[PDB]
Design a protein around this ligand. Structure first.
Ligand SMILES: *[C@@H]1O[C@H](CO)[C@@H](O[C@@H]2O[C@H](CO)[C@@H](O[C@@H]3O[C@H](CO)[C@@H](O)[C@H](O)[C@@H]3O)[C@H](O)[C@H]2NC(C)=O)[C@H](O)[C@H]1NC(C)=O
Ligand SMILES: *[C@@H]1O[C@H](CO)[C@@H](O[C@@H]2O[C@H](CO)[C@@H](O[C@@H]3O[C@H](CO)[C@@H](O)[C@H](O)[C@@H]3O)[C@H](O)[C@H]2NC(C)=O)[C@H](O)[C@H]1NC(C)=O
Ligand SMILES: *[C@@H]1O[C@H](CO)[C@@H](O)[C@H](O)[C@H]1NC(C)=O
Ligand SMILES: *[C@@H]1O[C@H](CO)[C@@H](O)[C@H](O)[C@H]1NC(C)=O
Ligand SMILES: *[C@@H]1O[C@H](CO)[C@@H](O)[C@H](O)[C@H]1NC(C)=O
Ligand SMILES: *[C@@H]1O[C@H](CO)[C@@H](O)[C@H](O)[C@H]1NC(C)=O
Lengths: 274, 273
């Protein structure tokens, strides 16, 4: 056969089967004579002789280097004609991601280009995979146009050349999008009890909240109520409810590229049918 | 240079200059070892060693063949790294015409194709030349509507600028219907041998016939002898009479046409202009 394939750092064995009565025999690395009979031309201690019988002439390149890849010939001399047999030593290298795109934040609707360049022997192929809801691309470049919020998360570059494990590495796209209210219940409370309104927005970056009644803002320091903010969530607390506290309150979530609000009612208890 | 160019059948000399402290040396024919130090690997008596000094390792392939053309490498081993140096043996062969078109006869107006195929190293170029004029410079010379003046010998010359160019010729003969090319009148005193004669120009040669008043004259008849060379024909009178003076017609004929002329056997007398 034509190909002798060896993984880098292991030993390559170059065996020459000899069917004809041979007078002289040699192993060549390109046009340099490595071994001629028992006479070692090379000074490389990696190149050693293994078999020297009239049926076989075999050497070994231990700890193979990329620089070893190339044509090695078993050249001989018979009593009739010279004969040769050429083999190609192919060195294989596990794949490795060199440069990878670094994490990004981008606003919704814009474009994103991720780039994954890798090396290996033979030249590796590469696949991108979105790690949420997914083979998105199979090229060094992954290009996304009009990025939606659900396209955020981790994209995984996987480079393989069918030598050892493929090399994987990941990059995180975080998409900014304006807020929307995702929780807003009404609450009923009897006069004189503790009443809790609360909203929850979904936004990147997180939304800040503000509480209004009839389009006038409520501050925390005011008596009888307190505004508390968590991640995404915000609560307006009444400690002693009165008949005036009843009504509609608007929770306004804002972030650097938009705002939204919802309105919820602090109402009094009572029976209801349908 | 990298190229050693040798004429086929001469000797090629492969000299390897060695500007280094070399421990081992060899001449390779492609991936075949020819000579390693003083150890001749080749069994070809043409390959002989010429120089084996610390500064030079040189062999010779005497009586070089085309099959020798290729890369020959002077491979060595130094104290530090192996080194090589390729030279390219280029074999040159004088040009030679292999097959050539054979002589033809063809009728006027038809087509003729002459073909001249030749070989050589490097591959030769070819020119045709009409010997009666470089008509073409290709293996194929194509002539359409061949005229009578295009007959004769066409010469193929193949050259590659090594040794002499090879030449060989082919003969086109064009058939055409006759035309009269000589027809003088002749005057003769009564009682003396008088010779009329015509000459036609035709391929193949024209045969002649002699007429008087659109009636043929035969050779066996007494007093007249008709004699035909190639182009020429002669009507001979041995005893002239007043009945014989007058106009005679020369009819030249060949396989693809005829023509005639008239000439007068005339009697003496005064004439003005
Ligand atoms: C088979 O033949 C090839 C071609 O000559 C040999 O490749 C050569 O290998 C050496 C190292 O093995 C390379 O030289 C130097 O390596 C050192 C690293 O220590 C570096 O510092 C130098 O910059 C340089 O690279 C050399 O470049 C390379 N030459 C070529 C044309 O590839 C190979 O060694 C031979 N292998 C066997 C088993 O005989
Ligand atoms: C250098 O190496 C080449 C091949 O690597 C040698 O070429 C071989 O040369 C011989 C004759 O010199 C050829 O054998 C002849 O074959 C013809 C028919 O093709 C036959 O008529 C003859 O009787 C003869 O056996 C051989 O085919 C040819 N092989 C190739 C692949 O070209 C060359 O001789 C070497 N030159 C040297 C050692 O000076
Ligand atoms: C809430 O949203 C509406 C638009 O739908 C707007 O008219 C209103 O002013 C907003 N309320 C507050 C307090 O921003
Ligand atoms: C008052 O709250 C209720 C419940 O969401 C809503 O239907 C109504 O439109 C709100 N009106 C205003 C001005 O917020
Ligand atoms: C000679 O030529 C003319 C026409 O070219 C023709 O009339 C005549 O018959 C021809 N033959 C002879 C024998 O004159
Ligand atoms: C006969 O001879 C005369 C004298 O040249 C010439 O003018 C005339 O054309 C000829 N007629 C024929 C039929 O040959």
């Amino acid at each position: 056969m034509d190909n002798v394939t060896v993984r880098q750092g292991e030993s390559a064995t170059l065996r020459c089967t000899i069917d004809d009565r041979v007078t002289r025999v040699a192993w060549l690395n390109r046009s340099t004579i490595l071994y001629a009979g028992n006479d070692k031309w090379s000074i490389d201690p990696r190149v050693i002789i293994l078999v020297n019988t009239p049926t076989q002439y075999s050497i070994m390149i231990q700890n193979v280097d990329v620089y070893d890849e190339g044509p090695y010939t078993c050249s001989v001399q018979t009593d009739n004609h010279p004969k040769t047999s050429r083999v190609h030593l192919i060195v294989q290298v596990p794949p490795q991601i060199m440069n990878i795109s670094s994490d990004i934040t981008v606003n919704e609707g814009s474009s994103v280009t991720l780039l994954c360049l890798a090396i290996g022997r033979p030249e590796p192929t590469v696949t991108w995979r979105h790690l949420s809801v997914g083979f998105v691309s199979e090229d060094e470049y992954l290009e996304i146009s009009d990025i939606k919020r659900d396209q955020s998360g981790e994209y995984e570059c996987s480079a393989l050349n069918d030598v050892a494990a493929p090399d994987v590495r990941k990059v995180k796209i975080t998409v900014n999008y304006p807020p929307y209210i995702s929780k807003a219940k009404n609450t009923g409370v009897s006069v004189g009890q503790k009443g809790i309104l609360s909203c929850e927005a979904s936004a990147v970056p997180m939304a800040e909240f503000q509480w209004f009644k009839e389009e006038t803002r409520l501050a925390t320091g005011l008596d009888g109520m307190r505004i508390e903010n968590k991640g995404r969530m915000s609560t307006l607390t009444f400690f002693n409810v009165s008949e005036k506290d009843y009504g509609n309150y608007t929770c306004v979530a804002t972030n650097k590229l938009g705002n939204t609000n919802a309105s919820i009612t602090l109402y009094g208890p009572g029976a209801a049918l349908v």
